[PDB]
Amino acid sequence: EGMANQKAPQDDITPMNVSNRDAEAVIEDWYASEYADRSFQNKLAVNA
Amino acid sequence: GYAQSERLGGDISWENIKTSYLINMWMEAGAVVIDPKGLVEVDYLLEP
Amino acid sequence: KILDNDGLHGMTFLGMNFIVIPSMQEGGLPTTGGGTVGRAFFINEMAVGYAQSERLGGDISWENIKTSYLINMWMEAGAVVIDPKGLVEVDYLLEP
Amino acid sequence: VEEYAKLCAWAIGRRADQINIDTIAGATYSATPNDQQGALVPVGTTGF
Amino acid sequence: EGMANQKAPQDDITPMNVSNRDAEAVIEDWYASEYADRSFQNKLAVNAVEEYAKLCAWAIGRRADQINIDTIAGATYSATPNDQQGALVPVGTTGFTFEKLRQAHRWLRQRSANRGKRTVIIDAIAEEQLLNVEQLTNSFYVNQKILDNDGLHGMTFLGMNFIVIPSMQEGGLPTTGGGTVGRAFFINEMAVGYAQSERLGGDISWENIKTSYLINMWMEAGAVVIDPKGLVEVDYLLEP
Amino acid sequence: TFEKLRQAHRWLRQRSANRGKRTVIIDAIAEEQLLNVEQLTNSFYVNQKILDNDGLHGMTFLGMNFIVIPSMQEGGLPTTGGGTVGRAFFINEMAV
Amino acid sequence: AFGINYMGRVSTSANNDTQKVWIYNGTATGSNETVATIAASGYFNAFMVNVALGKGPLGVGDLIIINGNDASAFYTVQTITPNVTVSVF
Amino acid sequence: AFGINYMGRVSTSANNDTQKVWIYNGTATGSNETVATIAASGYFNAFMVNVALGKGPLGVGDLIIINGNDASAFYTVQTITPNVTVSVF
Amino acid sequence: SLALSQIEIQQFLSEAHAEFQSEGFLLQGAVRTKSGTKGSIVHFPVFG
C-alpha cells in the first residue's frame, strides 16, 4: 500500500515504499468415476 | 485464492474388456490464503 | 581425407566400409576381459542374414481406465549367421 | 506424447542394431577356425 | 532414453521407464553507458555520440561472451565421467597435441554427441601450440593451408569449428593449476542453453539537466549446461 | 625460431589486433634464422616457394607481410644486449 | 530354461513407482521344471533386456508367483544386476 | 508417511461386489519404512477420503501386498473407520 | 520499489531436449536383408 506525501517545489520526488509478497497454491487432482455394464443397458428405463 | 486448472473435465468410454462404459470425471484445482486479514472464525456451542 | 570429414565413420579402406557404434544402453558392441578388451567385427555382406517382417509399427491410444496415453511402437525381425567364414573378430586393449 | 513417440522410435531403431550386433558377436571365433567358426585376431598386448 | 523389451502375446505391456530432469539458467543484467556533453559538439572533429554508441555495444557484446564462457567452464568435468559430468582430458605433461584432439573427439563420438554443430573454443595460447601440430597444418592431412590464412580461427577439423577467444578484461577463458594450465572446451550446440531476454537494448536520450547525451545500453541473459554429455574439456601446459 | 614466430602471432591475436594489414620488419640475421623453419619453406604448409624467390622479403605468412631491413648508416633496426640481441617488430597497420 | 510365453503379469496398475506382480507357469503345461530350478540364480536373466546394467521389466521387490511342476511358492526379486535372484516370500 | 505414488492396484476386475488387491512400495525406492511401521494402525489414513466415516478407495477385506525395506507380507484390511487397521493374511 | 523482486516469475520452455543417444538403424543394409517376410522362421539354404 502506497501513500501520498508532500515536498517543496522543484525538489526531487520521494516515493513511499510499496511492499510485495507471494502466495502459492498447490494443485490437486481428483477423480469421480463409475461403471455401467452393458448388461444393464436394455434392463433399465433410467439412462445409467 | 482458488485456482482451478480444470473445473470439470471427463471422458466417457466403452471398455470392451470389462464390457461396460466408464464414466470418468475429474477436476484439477488448489487453494491458498492470500490475505489472512480477511478471515474471521466464529466459535459457538452446538448445544448452548 | 578423413580429417576433413566424419573420421572413420563412413570411411572406405581396402574396399571395406567403417561404421562407428556409440555407447548403447542396450549393450552396443560387446566387451571382454572384464571390460578391458574391446571387440570389433569384420563382416562380409553375405555372411549374415537379416529377415525383417515389420520395420516400425506403432499406435497411440487413450486409456480411460489408467487416465493415460499409451505410446506403443514395435518391430519384428530376426537374424542368423549364414556363413561364419565371412566373420572376423579383432580384440584390442581399451587402454593400451 | 510427442516426445515419447519420438523417443520410442529411436529405441526401436537401437534394437534393430542390437539384433545385428548380437548375432554377429554370438558366433564362435577362433585363431585357428574350422568351417563353422569365425576368425579371431587375439588381443595380444596392444590396441587397435 | 527409452528401451524396447519383449513380452508374451496377449500379455499386458510393461514400459521401460524414461527419466526426466531440469536445467535452470539465472538471468542477469548488465549496463554499458556513457555521457557526451553538448559543449563538445563544436569542439571535436569526431562524432562523440556515434563513437560512444559503438563502444558501448562492444562492451555489451563482450559480456555476452563472458556469460557463455563462465557457464561452460563452470561445469563439472571428470576423467571417468558419469551421465551428469562432462568428459575431461587431463593435462598430463604435454601441451595441446594431436593426441588430445583425438581423445576429445572420442568422448563426443562415444556419448552420441557428434552430430550437428560442434564448436571448439580455445584461447590464443592454445592456438599457438596447435599451429605446431602437423595434422592441422600439413596439406596432405587436411584440404586447406591455415598457415596461408587466418590460422585456427574459423578452421574446421573433424567436423568441428574452432573459435579463438582473445584476452578480455571481462575474464576470457579461465586457467587452472596456478596459471600454468590452460583449458579448452569442445561443445555440442545442444549441450548448452543460453536464454536471451534482451540481446542488446538501449536508449540514447538528451538530458537537459546535465546538458548531455546519455548513451545507455543494456543486456539481459543467462546460460546453463543442459547435457554434460556434449561437453569435453582439454587441459594443456601453457609452457610445454 | 618457429616458436617465437608463433608467440608473436599469439600476442596479436590475444590483444585483438590480428585483423587487417599486418607487417613484420626484420633484419638480415632474423631472415637467415627463419629460413630454417620447415613450415615457411615447404609446399606442404604454404603455397609459395620462397626458396625460388626473394626469400622472406615480401613473403606473406599467416596474413602478415614480411619486410627485411638491410644495414643502414642512419641506424637501421636497433639492437640490444650490447649488440648481441636483435629486435624484430610486428605492426598492425592502424597501430602507427 | 526360461520361456517368455509362460510369463504373465498379474498387477493391473501401470504406476511405475510401485512394484509389479508376475505369475510363471513352470508346470507340466509350461516349462515343466521344479520350483528349485526356477528359483535358482540367473534363471530369469533371459527376461531382462540388459541384465548387466539391470535394464528390464523386472524390478527389485517384484513378487513372482512360481508354479513349478512339483509345488508352488511366492518369491520376491532381490537383485536385477548382474543376475536376477529371487528369495522366498 | 504414506505416499499415494507408492500405492497401486493389483486386481484388474472392476466388479465392486468383490474385494480388491493392492500393492505398496515401502522399500528403498519407495517409502523406505519397515513392514511393522506400514502395518501400524492408521498408517493408510491418508489414502482414504474421509476416514472418520469410512469413505475411501480401501474396503474391508481388501488384500494389501506390503513391501517394506526389510521384508514383505500379505495384509488384510480389518476396519476403515475410525482408523485403517490391517492384520496379516 | 526494489520489493518487486519478491514476485519475480520463472519461465519453462516448451522445447524439450532428449539426452544424447543413438537413433539406431546404423547397420541397415550392412548384411543380406530380406524384407516383408512372413512366418516365425526364415530359412536360408546353404551349399558346401
Side-chain angles (χ1 to χ4, degrees), chain H residues 20-42:
Chain H
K20 320 196 150 329
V21 186
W22 305 83
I23 180 147
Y24 192 75
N25 185 20
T27 79
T29 68
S31 267
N32 203 14
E33 331 188 281
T34 79
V35 178
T37 295
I38 299 160
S41 168

Side-chain angles (χ1 to χ4, degrees), chain G residues 12-62:
Chain G
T12 190
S13 171
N15 170 31
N16 61 294
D17 263 349
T18 192
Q19 263 95 16
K20 287 150 180 12
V21 186
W22 304 84
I23 179 153
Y24 194 71
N25 184 9
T27 81
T29 66
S31 310
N32 196 26
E33 335 189 83
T34 71
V35 174
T37 300
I38 301 167
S41 175
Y43 175 86
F44 285 107
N45 278 9
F47 197 35
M48 304 288 282
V49 180
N50 193 12
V51 78
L53 288 181
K55 282 310 164 43
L58 289 179
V60 168
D62 260 38

Side-chain angles (χ1 to χ4, degrees), chain E residues 20-129:
Chain E
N20 287 98
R21 57 175 178 93
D22 201 64
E24 303 191 355
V26 175
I27 312 296
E28 33 195 302
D29 282 79
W30 292 81
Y31 292 86
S33 70
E34 202 38 86
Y35 280 96
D37 195 70
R38 65 138 295 273
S39 82
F40 287 122
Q41 289 170 7
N42 284 339
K43 304 210 230 308
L44 296 180
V46 314
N47 195 339
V49 169
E50 155 193 323
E51 308 288 339
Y52 278 155
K54 183 206 325 313
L55 291 168
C56 291
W58 291 347
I60 288 306
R62 272 182 317 251
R63 178 51 61 177
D65 286 345
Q66 200 47 63
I67 286 173
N68 277 290
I69 285 152
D70 285 345
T71 285
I72 285 153
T76 307
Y77 296 90
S78 158
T80 42
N82 54 71
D83 287 331
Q84 305 107 56
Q85 301 175 327
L88 176 64
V89 175
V91 54
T93 54
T94 41
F96 214 150
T97 61
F98 179 56
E99 179 182 296
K100 299 185 164 152
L101 283 173
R102 292 188 283 112
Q103 301 181 229
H105 175 255
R106 190 266 296 201
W107 280 113
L108 284 183
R109 170 84 75 200
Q110 183 172 287
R111 304 165 112 189
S112 294
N114 212 53
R115 277 169 335 241
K117 164 158 44 180
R118 292 100 69 210
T119 306
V120 191
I121 62 174
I122 54 159
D123 70 284
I125 283 172
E127 154 173 67
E128 156 211 290
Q129 290 174 14

Side-chain angles (χ1 to χ4, degrees), chain I:
Chain I
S1 174
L2 265 72
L4 288 177
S5 62
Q6 301 302 110
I7 50 161
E8 281 170 344
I9 75 171
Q10 285 152 266
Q11 178 166 78
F12 303 78
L13 297 182
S14 40
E15 178 186 343
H17 165 77
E19 282 173 346
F20 293 118
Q21 60 195 267
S22 173
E23 321 219 331
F25 296 120
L26 293 149
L27 305 188
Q28 207 158 234
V31 299
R32 172 181 177 190
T33 305
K34 201 74 193 29
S35 275
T37 67
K38 332 287 268 194
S40 58
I41 304 172
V42 177
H43 303 255
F44 294 77
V46 170
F47 279 80

Side-chain angles (χ1 to χ4, degrees), chain E residues 124-125 127-129 131-132 134 137-140 145-151 153 164 166-167, chain F residues 2-3 6-7 9-10 13-16 18 39 42-48 60-63:
Chain E
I125 283 172
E127 154 173 67
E128 156 211 290
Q129 290 174 14
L131 282 178
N132 203 46
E134 214 215 357
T137 56
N138 195 294
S139 72
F140 279 85
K145 276 168 197 188
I146 65 176
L147 296 188
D148 280 316
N149 288 300
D150 327 292
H153 196 49
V164 183
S167 274
Chain F
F2 187 44
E3 162 148 87
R6 278 182 288 120
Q7 281 180 252
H9 178 258
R10 185 262 294 192
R13 170 85 77 203
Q14 148 162 352
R15 310 182 86 190
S16 265
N18 207 28
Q39 284 94 343
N42 205 231
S43 269
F44 287 174
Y45 306 95
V46 284
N47 274 287
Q48 69 226 285
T60 315
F61 184 73
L62 275 168

Side-chain angles (χ1 to χ4, degrees), chain F residues 67-85:
Chain F
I67 300 181
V68 188
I69 317 286
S71 150
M72 287 154 79
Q73 292 269 311
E74 288 82 17
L77 272 188
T79 50
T80 187
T84 67
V85 177

